[PDB]
Each structure stands twice: as structure tokens, then as C-alpha cells.
Amino acid sequence: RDRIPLQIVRAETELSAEEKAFLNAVEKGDYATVKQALQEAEIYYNVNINCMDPLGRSALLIAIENENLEIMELLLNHSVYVGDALLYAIRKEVVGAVELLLSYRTQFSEFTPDITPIMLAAHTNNYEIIKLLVQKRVTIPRPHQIRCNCVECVSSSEVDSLRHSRSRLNIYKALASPSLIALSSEDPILTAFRLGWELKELSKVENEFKAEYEELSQQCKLFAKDLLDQARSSRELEIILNHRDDHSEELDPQKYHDLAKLKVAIKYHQKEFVAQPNCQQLLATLWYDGFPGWRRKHWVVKLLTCMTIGFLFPMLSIAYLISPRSNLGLFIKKPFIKFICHTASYLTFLFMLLLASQHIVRTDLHVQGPPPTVVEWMILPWVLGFIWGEIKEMWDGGFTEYIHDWWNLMDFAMNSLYLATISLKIMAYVKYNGSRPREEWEMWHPTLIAEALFAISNILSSLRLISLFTANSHLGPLQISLGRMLLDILKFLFIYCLVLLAFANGLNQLYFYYETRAIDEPNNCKGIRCEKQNNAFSTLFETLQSLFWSVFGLLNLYVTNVKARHEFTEFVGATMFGTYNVISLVVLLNMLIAMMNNSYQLIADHADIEWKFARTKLWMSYFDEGGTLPPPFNIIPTERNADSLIQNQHYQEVIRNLVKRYVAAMIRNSKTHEGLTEENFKELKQDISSFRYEVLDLLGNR
């Protein structure tokens, strides 16, 4: 009982001694010894040619393992059992062995039953072997849609969920192979776009194997980017990026009509493809159409130029209305010029918002239904243009895509508040027809509500300017990274919201008995916004505000005392407040800082590619001919088969050259990328052993 006796618990059938030496000859590369043993086994039947080593590797698997082709034919000529040898040869990636097995054409296996030669070849991503199999009329099962309820999908999931999930992943691994896509895909770039997008969606539905599907999607994105990297001239790049996969759309004269494939890449979120330097360089040429040497100019001439066009925005817009074909009427159509004019037309609007409160007319604070002032009249046309422009996106873009962009949510709220202000101002103008001191106005007076709504819109309008940071090389990358950190912060606010409610309920439950009236308070002021704070925890609504303000240290400690001076109650209430301060300010606040620091490190990895993708969307929104006029001026009122066939022929020629260059580069990159392994050392050793045995056959003397 002081020793553990070790024995074989699951014993297999032992291998004879004659077979053991026969296998050793194959490993050593001893062709002569193997030839005699095979020939002897044809008569004596003393050794088993198919001797199953407990590891499962027969002589054939050992011959394939060492890449010894000459011996492989020796065993194959002797009618040895093949079984799953083709898969083992394909995995080893020995072209000679694969051709040999193809030419002629429950046991333990290292492969699952669903793996086929074509699927496994695509998994290895070997261009040469995949070409050999594809030439023999192979096919791959088509996976069903992500959300499929057919009888086969449901029955397979219920019959064997584990095998069903593994089979589907194996198919997608083969389809996502860059070598297979380059060989069998009519449009490899489009195929990589759709395949990578489909895999990203699958990684969400199939959350158990999310990492596997996300790696396949990344592999598809890289392949499309690497194909674009092989472009060698601007003509090749122009052909690729302007290719229309389909026709009969009839397009839209208001649309840009060019860069069709670039737009598809943006739709599928191909950020690396869009951020490619040659693609970016071409885009900058269109963006800076009127400035051939923009990059060579000093930062002072650039800034001076921007102010000149910005101040000239009022008449550039007018020219586009009067004489669009004129020399001056064409400047506004240049994307960068149009962007500056829109920005200038918006900075003017924000300047007038400041002037709203800068002008104060004494004796006019008491008009209940005052009419619009001078500043308000000028602001009105801007607001109508902003509302008209946003509705113009409803009918053009569509309901679904609008809500995706967070900046559109701020645009909707801003326009709704402006509309409410106008309607409220109209009601007050009609309801009241005189002056009255503002001190006697009711809490919900329409004029007071309109002023509050107008002021809230002003904050939203000013914050809109932050979206323009994307155009700047210094601020854009930082602004984009900041917006990526807001989603992680939002998760944290869920835990803090629970803590705030838990303590708010407890504090209000303790203090609601001692609520006092405003008449009994000094200055007749009740609440925490008074000079002497009181009734901090009298009601639940007040308690929530008090705990919010204590986060910034604006709630005084004396609010925990009651008039009756119940010492035990006051101490308990102050301990609840103290415990809340510890949890929120010492623990939760620091946890958010630690979480933010970790998340920012990851975000900083992809800051450049993310910003470039965002700036590309900004630039493309000014290429179109639709919204040329800024908001102030935007409210004033046969057969093409032959042309499409040629466009497709040029695309195919470029795709053919890109694949040729890409395949060579990948075959080149492997021979210098990775170091040697044990399989290489074993292969080299076997080569010498085979040579030694073959040479020793011719013994001059002994």
C-alpha cells in the first residue's frame, strides 16, 4: 500500500517481432530490406504487410511520413491497404505522394468522418495540391443560411449537435482558404468581402466557437487587402475600385456613380481594404481636386486658404444657384471646397446662437408672447434647412440605416427640440397679448418652456462640431478612439445605477418620516439647491439627485441631520451615506479607471485604420452631387451589354495578374518565414540513412 503498481489498463494487441523489424526498415529508409520482406511475405505469410502499429501508422503511413516516394510505390505495388492514406498525404503536403494516391485510386483515424480530400487540402492552403484536386471535378457542401429551420438543419442539430457544429465549421474553413478563393472564385475580392462578413455574423450566433469564426473572418479580410497590395499601376487600381459587379440598376444622377467596389467594401466594413495606402492616395486626389499641391503647402498657407473660402461660402452657394455651369459655379462641387463651405455655413449658425443671449432689451423680459427677435429671424432659415436636410435622408437613405450612426440620434433630438421651440413660441404669441412681470409666471408657462428647450438645443448644436474632428489628422485619430471607449463605459454605468438605486431606496426609507415644508425652511427654499441644503432624502426623486451630487462633493454633510435630533437615526443615515461614498468614489470609480486603461491600450492598436475608415466615409459623403448647397441655401428652390462586357473583361485581366503575383509572394513568404521543425530533422536524417544503405549495397570487399 506504500507503492503504486503501474500496469497497462487498456491493452491493445501486441505486434510480432518480425513486424517490428519490418517497420524499422521503413523508418531507416532501408529500401533493400523492405523489398525482401515484402517479397518474402508473398509466400511464407509470416509478416503482415498491413501491420497495424498501436499508434495506427502502418508502413504506408510511415512511407508518407518521411516523404520517401520510392518506398511508397514499393508498398503500393504490393496491394497494401490504403484506407485514409490520401488525407495523411495531403496533411503532410507532399505533392508526389498525393499524385501517386490519385493516379492509381472501425479503424482509428486522425481525421473526423466529415473531412474530405478537397476540404483538408483547403485547410492546409496549399495552392499546388488544391489545383490537383480541383482539376478532378470535386465539390464542397453548401452551408445553409445562418438562421435555417429546415428539416435537415433541425434534424442534424438534434441527432448530433457536436458533429453538426464541427461539420459546418470545417466547410467554412475550406471556403475561407485564400488559395481556394484565388483558384475557383470568379471575383475573388467580392467573394472575400461576402465570406468574411458572413463569418463575422456567424461568430455571434455561434457564440461557443466565436473565436474560430472570428479568425476565419479576419483571414478573409487580409486576403482582399493583400490582393489590392499587388496593384502596380494607377490604371490597375482604377479598374479594380470602379468595377460594378452587376448592372440594370440605372443608378441615380444625384449619385456619384464611381468607386462602386470601394462602396461595397465600406458596406461590408472592410476597414483594412479601405485604409490601403494606394486606395487612400487615390481618394485624396479626388478630395483635393482643386489643390494639386495641397500636401506640399505650409501649414500657414493652408490655414489662410481655409478662411478665404469659408468667408466666401455665401457667394459660392449663390453662384451654384444662378450659373451652375459658370466658372465660379463649379467650385462648390469640389469635395474639399464643399466641405469647407458647409463647415463655414455651420460656424455662422453657431455664432448667431451666441448672439441670442448677447442682446438684451430692457422691459422685454415681461412680454408673455414675444415675437421673434432679430437674431431669431436669421436663425429660422438655418433651422428649416437642417430639418429639411434630415428628412431628405429619411426618403433617400432609409429608416433603418439612419439610426445606426450615433451622430444621427443627436441630429434627430436637436431638430425635434427646435421644432418644439417654434410651436411653443407660436402658442404663447397667440395665447398672450401683453406684458406681465416674470415673477408671477407659472411653473409651466409656455414662454419659459420654450426658452429651456431652445437652450438645450444650443448645447446639442455646439457638440455636433466634434464630428468634424474626423477630418483632421491630429484630432481625428483621438476623437475616434474616445468614441470607442464610450461603449465600455456604458457597461460600467449599469453597475453604478444598481448601487445608486439600492442606497437611494435605503436612505429614503429612513428619512421620509422627517420631511419638512418649504414654509418652515429659511428663505422658504426646500431641497439641496438652496443655500442651506435640506430635505436631501425626503423623497425618492430628491434622494437620487442628492446621491448624484455627492459624487462631485456638492452635498454637505449636515443634510444627514433631522430637526428632532434622533441621534441613532442620524448616525445610521450618515453611515449609509458614508458607505455609498466608499463604494462609488473609492472602489467603483477606480475600477472604471483600471478598465478604461486596459481597453484604451487595445483600441490604440487599430487607431490609424479606424480613423482612416471614418475619414473615408466623411470624404465620400461630399463626392455626391445631391447635397451641394449648405442648409442656409438648400431650401431655396439603350442596350449597355457591350459596355458592361468590356468592363468585365478588363477586371478579369487585372484579377488574373493580381492572383499570379499574390500566389508567388505567399509561396515566397513561406520559405523565409518559419524555422525548422522536428519533421525536417527527421526527413534530413532519413535521407542520409537511405543513401548510406543504398551505397553499402555495392560492397567492394568484406
Ligand X SMILES: CC(C)CCC[C@@H](C)[C@H]1CC[C@H]2[C@@H]3CC=C4C[C@@H](OC(=O)CCC(=O)O)CC[C@]4(C)[C@H]3CC[C@]12C
Q: Which of 433, 209, 237, 463 is nearest to 353 (CA)?
A: 463
CB of 473 to ligand X, least distance (A): 3
Query: Out of 165, 644, 647, 648, which residue is the one contacting its own copies (CB under 8 A)?
Result: 165
Q: How many residues line the site for ligand X (CB under 6 A)?
A: 12
What does 619 interact with, of ligand X, its own copies, Ca ion, none (CB < 5 to 8 A by kind)? none
CB of 471 to ligand X, least distance (A): 4
| Pairwise CA distance, residues 448 & 450, whole Å | 5
50 binds ligand X per the rule CB under 6 A: no
What part of residues 549-588 is at the interface with ligand A1IMO (CB under 6 A)?
571, 574-575, 578-579, 582
Query: Out of 302, 392, 431, 529, which residue is the one contacting its own copies (CB under 8 A)?
Result: 529
Write out the three cell numbers for 403. Answer: 439610426
Quick check: 347 and 310 in contact, CB under 8 A? yes
Q: Which of 611, 639, 654, 353 is nearest to 474 (CA)?
A: 611
Q: How many residues line the site for its own copies (CB under 8 A)?
A: 245
CB of 477 to ligand A1IMO, least distance (A): 19
| Pairwise CA distance, residues 285 & 215, whole Å | 34
Quick check: 663 and 182 in contact, CB under 8 A? yes
Query: Out of 124, 156, 185, 545, which residue is the one contacting ligand A1IMO (CB under 6 A)?
Result: 545
Counted residue by residue, the chain has a size of 702
- What is the pattern of x (binds its own copies, CB under 8 A) and - over residues 445-484? ---xx-xx-xxx-xx--xx-xx--x---xxx--xx--x--
What does 414 interact with, of its own copies, ligand A1IMO, ligand X, none (CB < 5 to 8 A by kind)? none
What does 213 interact with, of ligand X, its own copies, ligand A1IMO, none (CB < 5 to 8 A by kind)? none
294 binds ligand A1IMO per the rule CB under 6 A: no
Name the residue with cell 414662454: 447
Q: Which runs of consecutive H residues, i.e. helices, occur in 230-334?
A: 234-241, 260-267, 271-274, 277-287, 299-311, 313-322
Q: Indicate the SS3 state at residue 435.
A: strand
317 binds ligand X per the rule CB under 6 A: no
330 binds its own copies per the rule CB under 8 A: no
| Pairwise CA distance, residues 285 & 109, whole Å | 58
CB of 383 to ligand X, least distance (A): 16
* Torsion sign, CA atoms 116, 117, 122, 123: positive
Instruction: Tell whether 694 is in a known binding site.
Output: no
CB of 543 to ligand A1IMO, least distance (A): 9
DSSP assigned state of 331: G
What does 209 interact with, of ligand X, ligand A1IMO, its own copies, none (CB < 5 to 8 A by kind)? its own copies
- What is the pattern of x (binds ligand X, CB under 6 A) and - over residues 451-490? -----------x--x--xx-xxx-----------------
| Pairwise CA distance, residues 114 & 137, whole Å | 19
Q: Which stretch binds its own copies (CB under 8 A): 68-76, 629-637, 642-650, 690-698?
A: 690-698
67 binds Ca ion per the rule CB under 5 A: no
Query: Going by C-beta distance under 8 Å and a sequence separation of 6 or more, which residues neighbour residue 260?
Result: 241, 242, 243, 244, 245
351 binds ligand X per the rule CB under 6 A: yes
| Pairwise CA distance, residues 155 & 143, whole Å | 15
Query: Out of 112, 308, 516, 652, which residue is the one contacting its own copies (CB under 8 A)?
Result: 112
Quick check: 315 and 331 in contact, CB under 8 A? no
Q: Indicate the SS3 state at residue 367.
A: strand
* Torsion sign, CA atoms 400, 402, 405, 411: negative
Q: Of 79 and 657, which has the nearer Cβ to its own copies? A: 657
What does 497 interact with, of ligand A1IMO, its own copies, ligand X, none (CB < 5 to 8 A by kind)? ligand A1IMO
Q: Looking at the DSSP assignment, which residues form a beta bridge with residue 367?
A: 435
Q: Indicate the SS3 state at residue 609.
A: helix
Contacts with ligand X by CB under 6 A lie at: 343, 347, 350-351, 462, 465, 468-469, 471-473, 498
Binding residues for Zn(2+): 144, 148, 150, 153
